[PDB]
Amino acid sequence: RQDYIAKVRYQNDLPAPPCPPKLLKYEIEKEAPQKEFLKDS
């Protein structure tokens, strides 16, 4: 079958990991400062 030459290849390649910048937990995200803050007089 001498016709137009064309190749079909579906692209489902997984991308590289993004490695985004990491958030910093607040002081109120730790249990001991929470205990200090809630027990305030």
Partner: protein, 77 residues
């Protein structure tokens, strides 16, 4: 903490209108690391007193629900 919590309970039994005594009772429950008991007590107080304008109680509920995580919508409210 035990003595203060008992005194808060006696104050609550004497006069139920003392909101400060109940909030101090919840604070003493937090002091004795009784997170679940304090949460149940706070939910009971909120459901009995939905019209009360206890801002610090709602702030404490939001912090507790954020620590729990699953109740994030109640924390937002």
């Amino acid at each position: 903490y035990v003595q203060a919590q008992k005194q808060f309970k006696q104050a609550e039994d004497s006069q139920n209108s003392n909101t400060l005594a109940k909030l101090g009772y919840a604070q003493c429950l937090i002091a004795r690391n009784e997170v679940g008991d304090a949460t149940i007590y706070l939910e009971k107080f909120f459901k009995e007193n939905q019209d009360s304008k206890s801002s610090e109680m709602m702030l404490l509920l939001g912090i507790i629900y954020s620590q729990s995580g699953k109740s994030y919508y109640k924390a937002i409210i």
